Amino acid sequence: SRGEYVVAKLDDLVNWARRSSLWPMTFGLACCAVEMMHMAAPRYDMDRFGVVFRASPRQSDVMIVAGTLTNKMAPALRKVYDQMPEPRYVVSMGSCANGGGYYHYSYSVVRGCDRIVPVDIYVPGCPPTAEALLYGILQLQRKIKREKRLRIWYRR
Amino acid sequence: AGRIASFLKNAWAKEPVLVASFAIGGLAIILPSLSPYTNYAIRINRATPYNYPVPLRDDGNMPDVPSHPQDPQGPSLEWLKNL
Amino acid sequence: MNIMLTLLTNVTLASLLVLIAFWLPQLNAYSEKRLPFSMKFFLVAITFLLFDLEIALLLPLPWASQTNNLKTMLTMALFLLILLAASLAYEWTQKGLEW
Amino acid sequence: MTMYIAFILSTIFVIGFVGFSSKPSPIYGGLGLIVSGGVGCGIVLNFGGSFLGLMVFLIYLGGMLVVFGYTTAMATGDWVIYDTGDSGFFSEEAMGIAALYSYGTWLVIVTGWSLLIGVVVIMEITRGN
Amino acid sequence: TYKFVNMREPSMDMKSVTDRAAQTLLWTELVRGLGMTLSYLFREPATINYPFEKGPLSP
Amino acid sequence: MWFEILPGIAVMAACLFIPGMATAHIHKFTNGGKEKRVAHFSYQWNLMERDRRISGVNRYHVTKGLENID
Amino acid sequence: MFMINILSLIIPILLAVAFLTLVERKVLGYMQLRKGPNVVGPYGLLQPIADALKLFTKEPLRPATSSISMFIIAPILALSLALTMWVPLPMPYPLINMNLGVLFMLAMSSLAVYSILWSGWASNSKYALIGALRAVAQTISYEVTLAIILLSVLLMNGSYTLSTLITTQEHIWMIFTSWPLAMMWFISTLAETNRAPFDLTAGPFAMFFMAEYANIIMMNAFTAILFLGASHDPHTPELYTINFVLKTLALTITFLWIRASYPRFRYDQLMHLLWKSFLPLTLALCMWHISLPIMTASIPPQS
Amino acid sequence: MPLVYMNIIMAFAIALAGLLMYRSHLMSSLLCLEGMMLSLFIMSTLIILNTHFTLANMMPIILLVFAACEAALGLSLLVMVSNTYGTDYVQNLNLLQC
Ligand SMILES: CCCCCCCCCCCCCCCCC[C@@H](O)O[C@H](CO[C@H](O)CCCCCCCCCCCCCCC)COP(=O)(O)OCC[N+](C)(C)C
Ligand SMILES: CCCCCCCCCCCCCCCCC[C@@H](O)O[C@H](CO[C@H](O)CCCCCCCCCCCCCCC)COP(=O)(O)OCC[N+](C)(C)C
Ligand SMILES: CCCCCCCC/C=C\CCCCCCCC(=O)O[C@H](COC(=O)CCCCCCC/C=C/CCCCCCCC)COP(=O)(O)OCCN
Ligand SMILES: CCCCCCCC/C=C\CCCCCCCC(=O)O[C@H](COC(=O)CCCCCCC/C=C/CCCCCCCC)COP(=O)(O)OCCN
Ligand code: SF4
Numbered sequence: 003s004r005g006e007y008v009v010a011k012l013d014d015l016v017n018w019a020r021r022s023s024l025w026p027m028t029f030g031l032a033c034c035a036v037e038m039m040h041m042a043a044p045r046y047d048m049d050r051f052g053v054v055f056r057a058s059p060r061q062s063d064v065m066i067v068a069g070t071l072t073n074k075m076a077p078a079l080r081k082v083y084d085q086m087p088e089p090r091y092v093v094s095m096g097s098c099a100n101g102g103g104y105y106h107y108s109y110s111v112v113r114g115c116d117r118i119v120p121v122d123i124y125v126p127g128c129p130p131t132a133e134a135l136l137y138g139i140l141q142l143q144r145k146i147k148r149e150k151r152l153r154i155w156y157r158r
Numbered sequence: 159a160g161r162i163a164s165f166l167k168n169a170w171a172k173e174p175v176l177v178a179s180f181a182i183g184g185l186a187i188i189l190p191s192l193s194p195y196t197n198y199a200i201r202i203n204r205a206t207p208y209n210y211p212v213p214l215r216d217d218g219n220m221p222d223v224p225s226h227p228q229d230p231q232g233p234s235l236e237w238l239k240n241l
Numbered sequence: 242m243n244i245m246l247t248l249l250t251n252v253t254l255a256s257l258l259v260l261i262a263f264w265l266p267q268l269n270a271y272s273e274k275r276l277p278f279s280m281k282f283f284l285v286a287i288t289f290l291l292f293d294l295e296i297a298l299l300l301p302l303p304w305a306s307q308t309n310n311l312k313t314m315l316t317m318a319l320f321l322l323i324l325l326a327a328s329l330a331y332e333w334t335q336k337g338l339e340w
Numbered sequence: 341m342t343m344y345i346a347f348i349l350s351t352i353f354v355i356g357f358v359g360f361s362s363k364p365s366p367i368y369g370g371l372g373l374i375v376s377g378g379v380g381c382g383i384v385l386n387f388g389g390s391f392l393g394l395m396v397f398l399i400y401l402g403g404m405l406v407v408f409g410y411t412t413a414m415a416t417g418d419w420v421i422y423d424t425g426d427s428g429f430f431s432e433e434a435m436g437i438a439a440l441y442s443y444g445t446w447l448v449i450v451t452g453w454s455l456l457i458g459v460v461v462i463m464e465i466t467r468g469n
Numbered sequence: 470t471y472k473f474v475n476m477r478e479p480s481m482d483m484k485s486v487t488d489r490a491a492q493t494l495l496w497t498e499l500v501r502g503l504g505m506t507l508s509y510l511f512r513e514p515a516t517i518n519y520p521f522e523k524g525p526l527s528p
Numbered sequence: 529m530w531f532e533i534l535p536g537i538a539v540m541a542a543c544l545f546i547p548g549m550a551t552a553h554i555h556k557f558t559n560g561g562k563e564k565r566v567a568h569f570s571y572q573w574n575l576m577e578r579d580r581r582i583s584g585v586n587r588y589h590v591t592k593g594l595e596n597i598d
Numbered sequence: 599m600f601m602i603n604i605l606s607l608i609i610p611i612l613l614a615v616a617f618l619t620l621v622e623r624k625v626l627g628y629m630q631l632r633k634g635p636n637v638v639g640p641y642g643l644l645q646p647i648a649d650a651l652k653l654f655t656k657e658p659l660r661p662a663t664s665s666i667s668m669f670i671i672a673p674i675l676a677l678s679l680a681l682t683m684w685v686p687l688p689m690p691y692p693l694i695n696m697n698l699g700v701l702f703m704l705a706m707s708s709l710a711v712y713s714i715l716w717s718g719w720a721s722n723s724k725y726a727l728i729g730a731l732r733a734v735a736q737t738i739s740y741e742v743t744l745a746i747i748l749l750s751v752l753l754m755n756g757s758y759t760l761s762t763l764i765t766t767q768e769h770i771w772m773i774f775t776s777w778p779l780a781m782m783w784f785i786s787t788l789a790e791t792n793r794a795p796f797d798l799t800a801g802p803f804a805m806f807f808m809a810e811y812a813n814i815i816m817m818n819a820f821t822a823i824l825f826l827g828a829s830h831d832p833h834t835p836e837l838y839t840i841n842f843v844l845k846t847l848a849l850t851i852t853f854l855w856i857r858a859s860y861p862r863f864r865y866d867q868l869m870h871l872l873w874k875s876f877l878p879l880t881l882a883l884c885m886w887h888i889s890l891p892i893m894t895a896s897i898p899p900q901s
Numbered sequence: 902m903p904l905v906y907m908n909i910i911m912a913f914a915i916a917l918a919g920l921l922m923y924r925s926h927l928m929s930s931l932l933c934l935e936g937m938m939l940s941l942f943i944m945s946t947l948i949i950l951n952t953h954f955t956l957a958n959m960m961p962i963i964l965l966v967f968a969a970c971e972a973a974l975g976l977s978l979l980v981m982v983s984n985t986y987g988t989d990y991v992q993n994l995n996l997l998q999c
Contacts, residue, residue, distance in 0.1 A: 022638040045516060060659065063656075089656055199895040209428070262804065266656060278984070294403075307897065328456055411980070428569065429571050440962075461974065503855060515632065532624070533628060544846060
């Protein structure tokens with residue numbers, strides 16, 4: 003009926019609005035952050051995708067973990083994640099953030115940022131290249147496009 | 159003579175804003191008393207009619223007061239036109 | 242009337258649009274989970290207040306220029322500005338503009 | 341007669357003074373005084389005193405109450421009595437106010453000296469030691 | 470061998486002092502920076518159209 | 529290239545064109561095809577009040593010409 | 599049809615502000631050898647709409663301890679003042695023809711700091727309170743010199759009426775008569791809106807953002823009216839409207855340029871800048887501009 | 902004597918009474934003084950404008966200026982009092998007793 007059509011159209015509009023402007027706050031923990039800043043460099047120009055450069059945590063949409071998460075830093079990252087508005091996503095960048103990487107068997111390293119916060123996209127590499135991180139960000143956009151909230155509320 | 163010039167030269171360096179401000183203020187104080195157009199401005203203010211000119215009752219003893227605006231006698235504004 | 246209507250319209254539009262912004266994300270369900278008293282900042286405000294008072298005194302200048310007593314008004318305006326400069330200089334030399 | 345708009349303005353002014361005269365939560369008292377000052381400025385402006393009303397609204401509200409709130413932040417019937425004629429091609433209020441430089445030489449002198457002494461007094465009082 | 474980076478002494482003649490005062494009052498070096506930025510706007514950007522264009526790689 | 533900034537700027541220009549022009553047109557439509565009469569100084573207001581009374585349609589803009597002098 | 603006039607003044611400014619952000623990002627990007635948003639829409643034209651929708655559909659984080667009253671009131675005051683300050687301006691004809699239009703704008707700009715004070719004090723944080731105090735002090739400091747420069751410039755206009763500024767500049771711009779005052783006025787307007795190099799500090803955040811950007815555009819428009827006089831022909835006001843809009847756009851792009859070209863001041867550095875370079879020069883030039891028409895017998899007519 | 906002047910005088914009397922109550926917060930004392938001067942300004946302006954006393958248009962501005970200067974002085978004093986105790990409570994000034 004028209005009831006499903008209207009919610010489908012509104013859901014498409016909301017998804018397009020949310021994925022056409024993603025505002026990230028970046029934890030520049032280590033060497034992965036340097037490739038982060040190369041994705042904002044003129045060659046790749048993250049800003050041309052609607053992805054703003056260095057958004058504030060109070061109005062950020064996606065969390066990018068770029069580098070090693072130590073035990074001493076995990077509570078701060080968890081607090082920053084907890085301080086985010088609800089439509090929030092986490093992108094794990096690099097091998098250290100994905101699974102501990104090259105310090106996996108260390109006494110002071112969290113073996114993956116997903117022990118602390120849920121992760122939406124995992125970007126492989128050490129560090130992953132700027133283009134690889136861009137691919138991951140674009141992938142997150144497609145994942146946001148695939149989601150459907152008004153439809154679920156309608157059928158529930 | 160030399161001390162004053164030295165002080166002004168030292169102030170023109172590392173303090174130009176204060177030198178310029180004091181010079182401009184002193185000029186603003188001094189110049190109006192020497193210009194010949196301040197009297198012209200006063201006269202221009204005098205010739206601006208804000209009120210109705212109330213006519214005078216004639217008694218036959220006012221040769222300087224005109225009876226009509228086109229009469230030659232009375233204040234003139236040709237100088238203002240020339241300005 | 243026209244100014245009142247314009248102010249009412251501006252305030253009403255701002256209020257309505259703020260309320261819709263504050264209530265549109267509140268219909269969908271979510272998780273729903275000192276002393277120091279710096280003294281220089283007070284002097285800045287006090288200096289601003291005094292200079293604003295002297296500006297209030299200076300304000301009628303555009304109409305003051307048509308009085309036919311131009312010498313007296315020029316003298317008084319210059320006097321007011323000189324005393325404003327003197328206040329600034331006194332507060333400058335007494336270390337009142339430091340951080 | 342718009343139900344004597346000046347009467348409502350005066351009543352709201354009195355209501356505001358009553359409101360912060362209880363002095364609750366001095367920032368709320370200051371905000372009540374801000375509303376009362378706005379109402380009084382509206383009274384003066386509606387009467388016809390455009391320049392003096394704007395002086396109220398600028399000086400009083402934007403400087404004095406602003407400094408008051410700043411320091412606090414550091415811490416924890418009508419229409420009958422009016423005229424018939426006109427004013428000319430000017431406003432009598434502006435002429436009378438601008439007469440301060442041609443007629444009120446004594447007023448300018450005393451006010452300027454008082455303001456300079458006020459600056460000096462503020463410096464001496466806030467010196468501390 | 471070594472170089473000095475900040476071992477210059479400004480001239481104290483009247484022309485040099487007037488030049489420095491003109492710089493202070495008229496903001497000449499600020500205008501120079503503005504001109505550099507303005508010129509740098511009118512040149513082609515270095516952005517590539519990912520994913521339709523790709524960065525260079527090596528075997 | 530740099531001219532790709534021109535579209536958005538153009539939009540701004542259009543957005544900044546609308547208010548002023550609109551006012552003028554409204555001033556032409558409410559004031560009988562002429563400029564809106566300004567009234568400072570209380571003498572122009574008297575002129576407007578006299579114009580309103582003479583027309584007979586209670587509108588200041590309607591102008592009574594010489595033809596009304598008999 | 600006064601309601602239609604109010605709406606036709608109030609809506610295009612908001613649209614202009616939304617598109618200004620795209621221009622600011624786009625202008626900056628090309629100044630940095632890159633592009634602005636050019637994916638959402640044909641040339642980023644849909645970026646402001648997506649931004650607005652996302653910000654309006656994002657959760658608001660009410661501090662759960664703040665005074666909801668002032669927390670709501672502050673954006674209301676910001677938007678109300680920002681939209682009200684456009685009423686006095688004549689482009690060529692003003693929405694409201696005020697006798698003391700400039701003085702009214704001065705009073706509104708003086709009110710503008712209450713939003714900052716209330717936002718800081720309702721934030722329920724010592725550090726945000728300190729930042730708000732710094733911002734308020736900077737704003738009052740620079741509005742002092744704004745007022746003095748403004749009255750000095752108006753001394754050649756003869757009144758506080760904004761329309762008379764068009765008659766004053768029918769032959770020559772005001773920039774040529776007094777450029778130093780225009781320089782200090784431009785810097786003071788940069789410092790008033792907390793714009794670089796003076797930028798030291800979901801829904802309500804967007805509200806404050808639109809208020810600030812509307813204030814930026816209005817400040818540039820007022821500067822263009824005050825110092826760059828456009829010739830007005832009574833039988834075709836569209837030419838004046840076009841010229842005024844072009845000059846306002848140029849001044850806004852100049853703000854973006856200055857943001858892109860310079861580092862930022864310290865707090866004490868801008869305090870010293872104002873209180874020890876602008877105020878003495880402003881007072882000296884105020885004295886000069888008081889005395890100048892009397893020296894030259896060039897006093898403006900209206901009284 | 903119309904009702905508006907009576908309302909303004911009632912407002913002034915209310916401000917004076919509130920100044921005389923002294924619940925706490927000497928800052929409220931300064932607020933009451935400023936409300937009093939605001940009422941004075943409003944009623945003096947209304948009287949002067951009404952009778953067309955052109956030269957009297959000087960007086961309100963003067964009043965405002967002077968009163969605001971007084972406020973500055975008062976604020977300074979308050980700070981020093983607070984600077985001794987940390988709070989602006991009235992009852993802290995109990996050292997001097999009759
Ligand atoms: C006046 C009343 C206003 C009320 C509130 C509404 C606010 C304004 C509404 C207008 C918003 C414009 C929406 C247009 C978005 C479509 C953009 C289009 O390009 O998207 C395409 C299609 O994608 C989506 O399918 C578009 C769905 C958007 C919604 C469709 C219709 C919604 C209209 C309903 C509005 C009614 C509002 C009722 C409530 C008041 C693909 O883009 P995308 O994939 O991203 O990018 C790929 C990048 N590549 C190409 C480089 C690889
Ligand atoms: C005689 C006593 C001298 C020693 C005692 C001094 C006492 C205290 C100092 C203040 C007294 C100064 C005298 C000023 C009285 C004002 C009246 C007189 O000056 O005439 C005025 C003349 O004005 C003169 O220009 C006054 C200039 C003097 C003021 C400038 C400096 C004042 C500083 C004095 C002390 C202030 C603080 C200390 C500063 C260092 C009036 O102007 P006029 O045009 O006829 O009439 C206007 C009315 N119309 C329009 C109908 C025609
Ligand atoms: C009665 C005339 C008034 C009219 C003109 C003035 C109007 C406005 C200007 C005055 C405003 C107030 C100025 C306050 C002055 C304070 C000076 C001071 O104490 O600062 C000294 C510096 O001041 C001085 O240098 C002393 C005087 C320097 C020269 C002042 C002008 C003297 C005459 C110069 C011009 C003479 C006439 C112009 C002719 C020039 C040729 C065209 C220390 O500087 P800091 O900021 O603390 O530095 C610390 C960090 N490094
Ligand atoms: C014959 C009769 C003539 C009467 C005399 C008139 C002569 C006038 C001569 C002097 C006029 C010059 C005044 C202009 C303002 C000067 C103020 C100034 O110089 O202050 C600077 C400060 O200036 C700044 O730093 C401001 C920079 C802010 C960044 C803005 C970028 C500048 C470029 C933007 C373009 C400007 C556009 C101006 C026109 C705008 C039109 C509306 C000093 O600071 P410092 O160098 O750090 O030294 C202080 C320590 N002692
Ligand atoms: S993942 Fe690799 S590149 Fe990134 S911080 Fe760890 S070691 Fe460095």
